[PDB]
Amino acid sequence: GPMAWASSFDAFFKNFKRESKIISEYDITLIMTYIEENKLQKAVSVIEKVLRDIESAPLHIAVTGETGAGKSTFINTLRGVGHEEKGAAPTTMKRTPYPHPKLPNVTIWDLPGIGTTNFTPQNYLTEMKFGEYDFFIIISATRFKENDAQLAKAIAQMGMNFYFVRTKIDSDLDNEQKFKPKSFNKEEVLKNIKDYCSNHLQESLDSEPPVFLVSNVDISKYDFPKLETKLLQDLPAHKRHVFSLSLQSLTEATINYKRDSLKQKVFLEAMKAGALATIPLGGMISDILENLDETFNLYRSYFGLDDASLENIAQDLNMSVDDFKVHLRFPHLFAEHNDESLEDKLFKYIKHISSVTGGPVAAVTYYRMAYYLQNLFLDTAANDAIALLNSKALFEKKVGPYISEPPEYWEA
């Protein structure tokens, strides 16, 4: 009943990383208050408004910095757009929008360097429509300018978030290794660049800013993963979903941010639809799977598992997409294996999933069968995306017929 539903809602959200939660701790408190106080309609109204916010949330990112800093390349890398493609930022004194190719409501803006302009910091922000943005990225390939520190100070005074991004770190490291092959120390180079930049910036700021050292040519390396985590941490909870969807699927961490965001969203949808007192029946599973077809194709698109995206990795292993797909779990996820019935496997899965946030004592909270099928597909899709990152190596060491880990609780 109500008290079991509130405690299982709290237990569900406790399982996620702090920077991944798509609702605030106050949203959680308010939903639990209404459920515990027998105000179930008020609880469902909060959840509906949260889902509307999450689903309609725009994301506008301002990227500012001088010419030669790798700003175009950064804007393209963030969007997953190749340098030669249509929509690519080309590789000069108004702001330019670059829409995300795959997500309507996400725009990366190219702002000209304040140093290109004769404006004060305050007036530069008015001119560039500062109110439109979720945060600012201040990019340099060198050291920063007093110019950048003053702009950051102005942004902080408007109560908004900025991040100093130092590009081309891979080029500086390569040059030093070639210069000093016997005494090269990567960590010393990184510390010396970060320290120079933060020490000069702080001369005009409240406290020591973090500087993120990145390579625009590999978003997996250096401080780029730390930057993605900080950007999530600092966003409003409701904007973390669209930002997670905007990330590449090029690291296990980014795949897991997408997996976690989507699992939270489909749980909220399940709450909105309503808790059930008994395990849902499997009589109509093919009809429920057919109703989810568009959804499962969307999930494939998010994880890079659509047929078009599989072509690149398959030629890479020098095999056909079809041969690669034999070794992935998502195609045959809802197929009978070892003559175990799909309904019996789902009944077992539901008992585990509902035991994880319910435990052995209190009334069990069940949801509609569609919730469990979505949850299962998302875990499978993510585990298939992780395996694609290391396919060559996984393929050699045949750890069974699939290269991916099984989705939690499905196999027995």
Ligand X SMILES: Nc1nc2c(ncn2[C@@H]2O[C@H](COP(=O)(O)OP(=O)(O)OP(=O)(O)O)[C@@H](O)[C@H]2O)c(=O)[nH]1
Residue ranges in contact with ligand X by CB under 6 A:
67-73, 91, 167-168, 170-171, 215-217
For residues 259, 218, 92 and 201, what is the CA-based torsion angle, rounded to 10 degrees? 90
3-state secondary structure of 340: strand
Separation between Cα atoms, residue 317 and residue 262, nearest integer Å: 29
Separation between Cα atoms, residue 271 and residue 9, nearest integer Å: 9
Within 10 A of 83 (CB to CB), how many other CB atoms are there? Answer: 12
Which is nearer to ligand X, 157 or 171 (by Cβ)? 171
Which is nearer to ligand X, 107 or 261 (by Cβ)? 107
Separation between Cα atoms, residue 233 and residue 241, nearest integer Å: 12
Which is nearer to ligand X, 168 or 258 (by Cβ)? 168
Provide, rounded to whole angstroms, the least separation between the CB of residue 179 and ligand X.
17
Which is nearer to ligand X, 94 or 182 (by Cβ)? 94
The three-point CA angle 315-88-382 to 5° equals 50
Provide, rounded to whole angstroms, the least separation between the CB of residue 313 and ligand X.
23
Q: Are strands 162-166 and 135-140 parallel, antiparallel or unpaired?
A: parallel
Separation between Cα atoms, residue 351 and residue 165, nearest integer Å: 47
Provide, rounded to whole angstroms, the least separation between the CB of residue 6 and ligand X.
48
Contact call for residues 93 and 235 (beta carbons, < 8 A): no
Please report where in the chains the tokens 């109500």 appear, as a residue. 2
- Report residue 41 as tokens: 């309609």
Within 10 A of 323 (CB to CB), how many other CB atoms are there? Answer: 11
3-state secondary structure of 166: strand
Which is nearer to ligand X, 51 or 173 (by Cβ)? 173
Which is nearer to ligand X, 67 or 291 (by Cβ)? 67
Residues shown for the chain: 412
Binding-site residues, in ranges, read: 68, 70-72, 168, 170, 216
Provide, rounded to whole angstroms, the least separation between the CB of residue 406 and ligand X.
38
Provide, rounded to whole angstroms, the least separation between the CB of residue 199 and ligand X.
22
Which is nearer to ligand X, 71 or 300 (by Cβ)? 71
The terminus-to-terminus CA distance of the chain in angstroms comes to 29
Instruction: Please identify the residue of the shown chain whose CB is closest to the bound ligand X.
Output: 70
Provide, rounded to whole angstroms, the least separation between the CB of residue 76 and ligand X.
8
Provide, rounded to whole angstroms, the least separation between the CB of residue 83 and ligand X.
7
Buried-exposed string 136-147: b where 16+ CB fall within 10 A, e elsewhere: bbbbbbeebbeb
Binding-site residues for GDP, in ranges, read: 68, 70-72, 168, 170, 216
DSSP line for 181-249: TTT--HHHHHHHHHHHHHHHHHTTSSS---EEE--TT-TTSTTHHHHHHHHHHHS-GGGHHHHHHHS-S
Which is nearer to ligand X, 215 or 254 (by Cβ)? 215
Provide, rounded to whole angstroms, the least separation between the CB of residue 95 and ligand X.
14
